[PDB]
Symmetry: C4
Subunit: 463 residues, 4 copies
């Protein structure tokens, strides 16, 4: 019997090191510095030589135009040998052409109160699919001034910080050289292409590095709330599109075939309470979804093929970059659970079995109290969100009030801005929360664990 | 019997989701960014193009005048279509006219020691109602140079950081356009309108956004301590004055009528130790006070009606903004306690009843020790306030010494400035406090909880 | 018997509120802002309009001269009505005249290794009383270039960050007006008054505010390590020299007489193990030392009397400012222990007596373990000081390694600079320390407390 | 018997204070400020008067050349008396001559995917020993353009942040005076000496201070990842090369002879489970390795002798600086364990023996759980490294994911950049980690300790 348990064990071990290789394989080492250099080049540099603002700092439309005609262009273009081709840092192709796209809301989307109608002529509602503006505003001379559908314009919905944004909109494709684009952008500034109705503008381009082999897909997102102002956000996503270059790449591709066999085998075994059963299900479920993504989605690479035909176009990678994120996310979570499955095999020792039986017994009591706990925890969260949240960034949304309260328990705090927001409840909230939660309530978990642990040591000693 | 308990339960649940809607309803989602853009526009921008100071940074009267003639004016005025009307960010009316007001203390308010009378001619005491200056200083040509009572000048006492300030004072109303105000402020600077005797100056104006429907009331407060210098502070308060625009607004107004019924019903039930009784009282008390505020106070909106008649005046919203703060505060605290009332219904399960009976028993022991605890805790607070508090900001006041000690327990610390203040007690205070409080004393709570918990598990197991 | 215990109790209570008044009385409320404005005026302002350095930032002698001829002069002088008198912020007399003093080390104080004697001509040792330079360097035209003894130059030893400094040295007194001093300082710069041999320079002046009644004594200390460079440090100390102005000042002076009676009475009672006895001794000891300081030291005020005779001199307050620090320190520590003496009276309740008997029993076990603990704790401290401490500021000295380890336990950390210092032990130190100390060892206290607590609840229940 | 235990005790005590002296002796007090001034002079100063970047901030090759021709030269040269000799801060010889060295990778080191070969002409692989470029690029006019082997160029492999770097490379030695070097560096800039193929450049020089007697060896390392950009790093290492100057130096040298005797004696005693035996072994092992380093390695000082002959050369100290690091590291770790050996002697008291027997019993249970713990801990680490690590600095490498998770437990967090990286898993990771690890799992240690402690108090009381 112990042999059969060890029989399935060695099976499991290989499944680890197979999976251990893919992750280490599918992720190059220093990639962090590849994004870091991109980000610092765009995000972190002064919008203009005389200006102190970053891209992260943009407060206004005026700042935005200074960015486009500013550090952005000077970030995208380098000379340097085509010379129509520009190597960022000299190591990185700007791949194809950048694209700017905006989203726009209709005039009468909202309604002015009858009292002020004599005062205010027109309003523009918060962005929504219903309120979107499809009208051909402006000179109507091209794709910049004419709406194009999300189908006709290949693209997908992007999820921003205040809203989700459709792929459709008013877009313009830039040019290969700095001189040509600077003309276009100037024209988009001369004519007013950012108006009261613009909610969001996207700037997307892709970069290819040949030293290591990686694409980098960039999305610079700028939102224009109905309240005025600017909310910048960005995404820098590396990709591995060309999977066969080095022999080591072929080495990995072998495993992805081998790794496919195991899952097929675990599906076989899984055919037929318990916790460890619920574990195996979760692994197999995610393991399939990972492969499903890896094949009929991320292995298509139809875009690259089209792009390499004509290199003057916009290389739309937004989807490919999207799925590999979803892939990496899922792949990681599998790996995590796969490690936890190892505890099933640690019961060899007395002391280990001594512990496992305790935590198994810990569960029913703790879970019962966690409910009691989070009801109180979420009460504060909802309280903090009503008192703060029009003031403090950390409390801005109900999601982030929850996260902030974890940071408080750990000691990450900005107390000053809490007290500035409300000089009465700010202190009361903080004090009472820190008191009841951190002093009394956290200790109530640890009370449960001691009892249930010492109890299990009591009776097992009786045996 | 269990049906009756469940009978009152479903009653309670509806009362939640009713109340859950109002809060979510009465608070728009992204409002945070509406204040954030206002604040960054005024607080966060350099006082002048050549100057590095914010409004938050003001160190002197000279800096203050640079702010008024500086970023303030350039923040309030935009061109842009009336053109007498100015849209901040282009989305936000500057509503009516700004108003500047100062407070002033009499000459002989204080007394010079007889030894130095030959040296120093005149002193000016710390601001107080007694020492306030009602004399018509200066050219005496208008409301700027003539005192006006808090009654005659509609307004209320504001509570600042070093003092409470009456609504009365010397005020001047600005103009609609940047050119006219810049003349006025220049005249207030030419003639000396900020002198030895000025303790505080207020800058108040209101802003209306039509996209979302919200007013924003702004108070820029600047204090001039008797010690010289400047202490800036600010308040940005959104308001919802016009309550019927969208159908969803009508949807909410229905609930506020429905919600009024429940409280009337709970008042009926409450007519006749125990803890849960003390809970219901607290809810009903606050729930009434909330409605009282909501009706005969915040539902008056007499000011708006007067303002819309003549739009060249100062739209005094200070009160309306005040009460909605008090309203939101009270509303939040009710919601908080309403959630806690849910524990009364969690006793269905064994394990829950297992826990409830423990924490009920935890109380008498913990409270007994908390007294023992805070006596020690407050001892340090008073110690730290005497040693520090002339040096370190965090210890500046006895209130904030208490808060600082919570931040220390959690790990939020600036130790450097503590050691700079006193190089001997600074370390001794910090060491001993962290030692006795965090090591020994916190653990004394958790000692109590373990005992009382394991005891309750002992005897209930006997049954 | 319970009456006698209550008889001594009410005696004790009055002693609190008497002492509670003096502290609140002897410390004005907003004084923090009085120093804060002084500090920001001097410390925090750019050394020159074109320079970005503060006084806190000084890296070099060149920076120092830029400070003296820079923000310092522009900080000390204001116009403004004598006009020979200058009111800082317009509220604050510059009192008398500033004074600059330096300390200097002899040439041959150190010894050059025989190998390099052909290379290096001369060395200057670290500052010490033995190596001090009394020679009249330079043009020898005045007190700036001639040594004056600590006796002949009224003054005391000051304790700096790298060394203790005698009051003696080479000093120069500045002038009343900005124009005259700027000439002097220029001459001290033209002629080289800061040379290889200068270890430290002091800048001392006093400021009087008449609105509130307080002096402010300032010491700007700049050290010049033997390694080259600059280490700035500062002290801003308020004082209350004139004790009778307001009636409330007379009100306090009454208590200081009353408060003297109590201590005389407690000395009577104390004439004749136990812990509470050891408490009363400590209070009475400190309470005497406080009064001793308060009378024959701080109540002398002979300097002020001399100063007010001739106001063109340097008002040496360094001692008076020193003692009131020592006074405030001692006064605070008494107050702290006085509160703790209150626990002697909390034994009325069962639960309180229930707790007191536990912590009394906790002592012998905890203290035994604390020894075991700090041996390990200090081991790391000594380890961290050897590995780091040539690199990381926080570990610079063995004293501060101890403090840093407390900050680590609480979560205040700069990990980056630890890893930069040593990329191997840095992580190992941090990991192992956080592991053994925070996981295992802290929990060993709490293990002791639970046992000894639950034990005391066990047997007392048997009674 | 107790005498013999005390007999070995006093032996041990002397061994402490002997060792206590050496450490305090071998480490001068204020050395921290000696490096701090060096670092701030080079690292912390603006690359140019018009530029805001430090050396720490370098983002590009262009920035690098601005640094060399910039603050570096102005940092190395001072006038000041030879005058060919330059005293940094006037206290510090620039010793000999600086040296710049770069490392270079071959053209075809990597391979371009066949699809893009028409596009991209050439690639340069990540630095490795295999891909290193030994070809004489450029004008081939000197050691700057010609490869020199690590043997022929005295030097050792340096371990950088992304790679290990051989001592070999293309180097150039600068000149004694600022004017001459500025010509050389200009020529290295005119001709392109930093190209696509440069992975890393080193700048090494040594500084001698005669006031205190210390050398300071400096390494300024700049890496050029294959992804483009710059990654600066630095090392400032003090040294004591000349060991006999002061009598106190002779005093220490006596102990190093005495200290050699003890280890010889403990080797004698150690000749022949238990834990304390395993302790003594570790001490003796390290104690030997320390002396081995101290004699046939660090006591050679052959370089200094050669250097003092001809002072126009490059004084290569890289090795000497290296070993004293290794020496200080080992010396510290010995001292640490030596303190812990003191617990062997604390068993005199009951309470101490009461504790020792507990922690001895704590071990087997805790260690069993630590395994269970770190499996979970490392699971998160591997998870966080896959999700983050292309984004967040703190997660950049798997090593640092581990360290980051310790900082999270303590409360050191940057949550913002976690949420920006991944807006879904970022919160989930952080929440679940903080929940399971900090709430449940940490408390599982403390559960073990309570049980095993109270158990030992149970049975010992029975005796
Ligand atoms: C928006 O609609 C209102 C409603 O009539 C109209 O008065 C205004 O001119 C419109 N503005 C634009 C830019 O279409
Ligand atoms: C549309 O008309 C404007 C007005 O002159 C012109 O500047 C612009 O170039 C035109 N658009 C295109 C695509 O030619
Ligand atoms: C979408 O993809 C199709 C596929 O060839 C292409 O023809 C079309 O131009 C794309 N749409 C764009 C680039 O807007
Ligand atoms: C303030 O009062 C004193 C008291 O006589 C007087 O000398 C001084 O001129 C007064 N100053 C002002 C501005 O009124
Ligand atoms: C008061 O007199 C001054 C002095 O000329 C003048 O500048 C100011 O305008 C006058 N005030 C008013 C309200 O006209
Ligand atoms: C106060 O309110 C009354 C009400 O109409 C108004 O007449 C008066 O002008 C207000 N006071 C001001 C604006 O100072
Ligand atoms: C310091 O002493 C040395 C020893 O002779 C001498 O050569 C040097 O000139 C002296 N320098 C000064 C400034 O006194
Ligand atoms: C000492 O001599 C120098 C040299 O001219 C002179 O500038 C300085 O003023 C003299 N000192 C005094 C106190 O006059
Ligand atoms: C020290 O105090 C005495 C007392 O009058 C005074 O005469 C002397 O000038 C003082 N020394 C100074 C100011 O250096
Ligand atoms: C690098 O190698 C490729 C391969 O042929 C060649 O085309 C290119 O010119 C080479 N570049 C340099 C700088 O040697
Ligand atoms: C190599 O040739 C270049 C080209 O003129 C010249 O500038 C450089 O000085 C030469 N190298 C040496 C070491 O002379
Ligand atoms: C290495 O050391 C030898 C020993 O004398 C020396 O001759 C040679 O020049 C050194 N190599 C250098 C400095 O590159």
């Amino acid at each position: 019997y112990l042999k059969s348990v060890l029989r399935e064990l060695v099976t499991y071990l290989l499944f680890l090191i197979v999976l251990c290789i893919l992750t280490y394989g599918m992720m190059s080492s220093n990639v962090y510095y590849y994004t870091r250099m991109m980000s610092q080049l765009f995000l972190d540099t002064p919008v203009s030589k005389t200006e102190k603002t970053n891209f992260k700092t943009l407060s206004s439309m005026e700042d935005f135009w200074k960015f486009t005609e500013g550090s952005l262009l000077d970030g995208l273009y380098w000379k340097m040998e085509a010379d129509n081709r520009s190597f960022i840092f000299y190591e990185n192709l700007l791949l194809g052409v950048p694209r700017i796209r905006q989203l726009r809301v209709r005039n009468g989307s909202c309604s002015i109160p009858q009292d002020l109608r004599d005062e205010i002529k027109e309003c523009y509602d918060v962005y929504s699919v219903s309120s979107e503006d499809r009208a051909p505003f402006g000179p109507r001379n091209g794709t910049a001034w004419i709406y194009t559908s999300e189908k006709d314009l290949n693209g997908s919905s992007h999820w921003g910080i205040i809203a989700t944004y459709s792929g459709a909109g008013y877009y313009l494709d830039l040019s290969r050289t700095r001189e040509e684009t600077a003309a276009q952008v100037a024209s988009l500034k001369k004519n007013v292409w950012l108006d009261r109705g613009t909610r969001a503008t996207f700037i997307d381009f892709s970069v290819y590095n040949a030293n290591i082999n990686l694409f980098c897909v960039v999305r610079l997102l700028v939102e224009f709330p109905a309240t005025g102002g600017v909310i910048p956000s960005w995404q820098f996503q590396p990709l591995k599109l060309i999977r066969y270059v080095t022999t080591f790449d072929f080495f990995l591709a072998a495993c992805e075939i081998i790794f496919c066999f195991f899952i097929f085998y675990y599906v076989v075994e899984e055919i037929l309470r318990s916790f460890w059963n619920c574990l195996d299900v979760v692994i197999v479920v995610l393991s399939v979804v990972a492969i499903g993504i890896n094949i009929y989605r991320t292995s298509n690479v139809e875009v690259l093929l089209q792009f390499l035909e004509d290199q003057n176009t916009f290389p739309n990678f937004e989807h490919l970059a999207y799925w590999q994120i979803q892939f990496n996310n899922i792949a990681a979570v599998t790996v995590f659970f796969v490690w936890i499955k190892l505890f099933k095999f640690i019961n060899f020792n007395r002391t280990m079995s001594q512990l496992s039986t305790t935590m198994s017994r810990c569960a029913k009591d703790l879970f019962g109290f966690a409910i009691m706990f989070f009801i109180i925890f979420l009460a504060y969260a909802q309280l903090a969100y009503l008192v703060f949240g029009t003031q403090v960034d950390d409390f801005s949304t109900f999601q982030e009030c929850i996260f902030t309260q974890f940071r408080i328990i750990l000691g990450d705090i900005n107390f000053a801005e809490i007290e500035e927001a409300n000089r009465v409840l700010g202190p009361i909230y903080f004090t009472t929360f820190v008191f009841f939660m951190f002093f009394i309530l956290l200790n109530m978990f640890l009370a449960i664990i001691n009892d249930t642990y010492s109890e299990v040591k009591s009776d097992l000693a009786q045996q």
